[PDB]
Ligand binder design. Structure first.
Ligand SMILES: [Ca+2]
Ligand SMILES: [Ca+2]
Ligand SMILES: [Ca+2]
Lengths: 322, 323
C-alpha cells in the first residue's frame, strides 16, 4: 500500500495527481484510503532570491495536489497579482506572485528559526493538505547550476539553472551542469526509508537531467534506489508525434544525449547493470530496447488525472505489483 | 543653503514637503537647486515582521517626497493590494499588521541588503535612487533603537513590554500604559552624517510630529542630543498641539505625565539657554505659551497643503532670523 515517486517540475506534480486519482488519495478521496503516497521532490531549482527561500518543485506539488493552481493558466495561484514583482523591477533588480511571496515569507522564517526544509514543508502542507508526503530530496543545499561561457569576458561561469533558463539558454555556449552542494548533502529525512520500504518506486516523466537527475546527485539516494526490493519503473518524457516532430530537449543537449526514449532509458540504465531501472515505459508508437530492462509502449500523455491514472496502472502491471 | 529637520510620522513627511516647496526642491524643482534639505528620521518604530525589516518613518518620507504615498491613509503605497497579507492569514500566522504587496518589495530589498551587511543609511540611499525624494533621508541611527511600551496585558493582567507597533496598531493605546522605553538608544551611535547635518545647518527644525514617540526617540540617541546642544544653528520647534480641536499624541503625553498643551510640550524639549533644546517655538493661531529662553510666536500651523506648510517653514526661518 506504499508508493514512492521521484518528482520534479510541472510534470512531476501532474503525475502524482494521477497516482492520487488511481488510489483515491487527496482531492480524489471518497472514504479514507488504503494507500499512502510518498514523493521524493527535487530541490535542484531551490534558491535564495530577494532574501527569501524559493522551492519551486516542492511548491508545485503542494499547490497542485492541494487544489491551488489556476486551471486556466496551469501555473500559480488563482486571483494572483504581481504587484510586488512590479515594484521590484522599479527598484531595478520565477514569476514571484504576491500570493506566492507569502509562502516564501513563512518558509524563510521557519528556516531561519532552525526548522529543516522537511519540517517547513509539513508545516505548509497543514494548510494545503496535499494528501501526499512531500519529502525534499535533501534538507541541505543542492542547487543545480549551468556552466556557460560568459560573453562579457569569455570566462566559464556557473549560473543557477533558473537564471540560465530564462536569460542565457540558447544565447551563449553551455558546457555542463554542476550540482552546487550535492557532495556535502545527505538524503533528507525519510527519503532512504521511503525508497527502501516501498512496494514500488516510480520516476515521474519529468526532465531526466534537471528534474529527476538532481535527486540522484544527493548522496545516499542512488544507493537506496539500487538496493531496494521495490521494483523501479521509469516513465519516458519523450512524446513523439508533435507538429514538425517537436524539438530536442535543451537540457539533454547540454550533456549530449539524444531526445529519444532509447537514450533517456540508457541514461538511467538497467539495475541489472549499474543503472536504476527495472522497467521503462514509453509512449504508444515508441520503442526502446535496453539489456536488462522491461520496456512496454502504452499511452503516456498526462491529459487529465484519469489518463495519468491509467499510466500509473500500466507501471504497476509491468512491475507485477498489486 | 542647508536646512536640517527632525522628523517622524505622516506629519514629518508633510512638513518636509513644505520645506521642499519653499526652496524649490524635489517635485517642486524649477531650475537650478540652491538649497539642500536633510531629514533626520525617527527609527524608533522600526521592527522585524515576518522576517523583513519595516522602517515606517523612513518609508513614509521616501514615498511622500517621491509621489508614491497613499493620500487616504497617509502611510503605504497608492493603489496597494493585500493579496500576500491575505495568504499569510490563510496560513494562520502576527496578523494585526498590514504588509501591502507593493510595500513588501521595499521590505524585501531592504531586508536582503541589511542581511548582506549594508548599513541602513546605505539601504536608504539605494532605495531613494528610485524615488528621487529630493532630500537626504538620514536614519537617526544605523543601529537598533526600538521604542517599547510597558503595559498591563488584559489577557492575564501581567506587566508586558510590546513594540510600539503593537501598542498603536493592535491595541490603539487603549490598554493600561505605564512607560516608554528606548531599548538600545544608549548603545546606538548617531547615523552617518546626522551629527554633521545638525552641526553644519543654517537652521534646525523639529517637525510638529509626536513629541514622545516620533521626535523624542531621536533625542534619546546620545550623539544627536549633543549635536543639537552645541550647533551654531538656531533650533526651531513646531508645537503639535492645535488645542481645542482634533491622532493620539495626546495619549503618549499622558503616559509620561505631560499635559497636552503648547506650553507643556515646549517645556518638554526645553530651552537651550537652560538644559533644553529649543531657541524658538511656534504655536497655532489663538494659542499662547512662553518659555524662559525661548522666543514663542503664534502663527498658522496647519499642514493642509504644501503651500500652507511652506509658510510654516518661512515663519520658522523668520523667528530664527535666518534668510
Ligand atoms: Ca500528433
Ligand atoms: Ca552599538
Ligand atoms: Ca535617556
Amino acid at each position: 500500500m506504499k508508493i514512492t515517486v521521484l518528482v520534479g517540475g510541472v510534470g512531476g506534480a501532474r503525475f502524482l495527481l494521477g497516482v492520487q486519482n488511481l488510489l483515491g488519495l487527496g482531492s480524489f478521496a471518497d472514504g479514507p484510503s488504503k494507500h499512502e503516497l510518498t514523493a521524493v521532490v527535487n530541490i535542484g531549482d531551490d534558491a535564495w532570491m530577494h532574501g527569501v527561500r524559493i522551492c519551486p518543485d516542492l511548491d508545485t506539488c503542494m499547490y497542485t495536489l492541494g487544489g491551488g493552481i489556476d486551471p486556466d493558466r496551469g501555473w500559480g495561484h488563482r486571483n494572483e497579482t504581481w504587484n510586488a514583482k512590479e515594484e521590484l523591477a522599479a527598484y531595478g533588480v520565477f514569476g514571484l506572485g504576491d500570493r506566492d511571496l507569502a509562502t516564501h515569507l513563512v518558509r524563510s522564517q521557519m528556516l531561519r528559526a532552525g526548522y529543516p526544509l522537511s519540517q517547513v514543508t509539513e508545516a505548509l502542507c497543514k494548510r494545503w493538505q496535499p494528501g501526499a508526503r512531500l519529502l525534499p530530496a535533501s534538507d541541505e543545499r543542492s542547487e543545480t547550476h549551468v556552466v556557460i561561457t560568459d560573453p562579457t569576458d569569455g570566462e566559464r561561469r556557473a549560473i543557477h539553472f533558473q537564471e540560465w533558463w530564462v536569460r542565457y539558454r540558447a544565447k551563449v555556449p553551455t558546457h555542463s551542469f554542476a550540482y552546487v552542494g550535492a557532495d556535502q548533502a545527505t538524503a533528507g529525512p525519510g527519503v532512504v526509508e521511503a525508497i527502501g520500504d516501498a512496494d514500488i518506486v516510480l520516476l515521474a516523466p519529468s526532465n531526466p537531467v534537471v528534474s529527476i537527475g538532481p535527486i540522484l546527485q544527493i548522496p545516499g539516494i542512488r544507493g537506496a534506489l539500487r538496493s531496494t526490493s521495490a521494483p523501479v519503473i521509469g516513465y519516458s518524457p519523450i512524446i513523439a508525434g508533435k507538429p514538425l516532430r517537436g524539438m530536442a530537449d535543451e537540457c539533454l543537449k547540454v550533456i549530449g544525449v539524444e531526445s529519444t526514449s532509447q537514450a533517456v532509458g540508457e541514461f538511467f540504465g538497467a539495475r541489472a547493470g549499474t543503472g536504476l531501472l527495472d522497467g521503462w515505459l514509453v509512449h504508444e508508437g515508441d520503442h526502446a530496447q535496453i539489456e536488462g530492462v522491461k520496456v512496454k509502449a502504452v499511452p503516456l500523455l498526462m491529459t487529465d488525472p484519469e489518463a495519468t491514472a491509467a499510466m500509473v496502472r500500466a507501471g504497476l502491471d509491468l512491475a507485477g505489483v498489486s
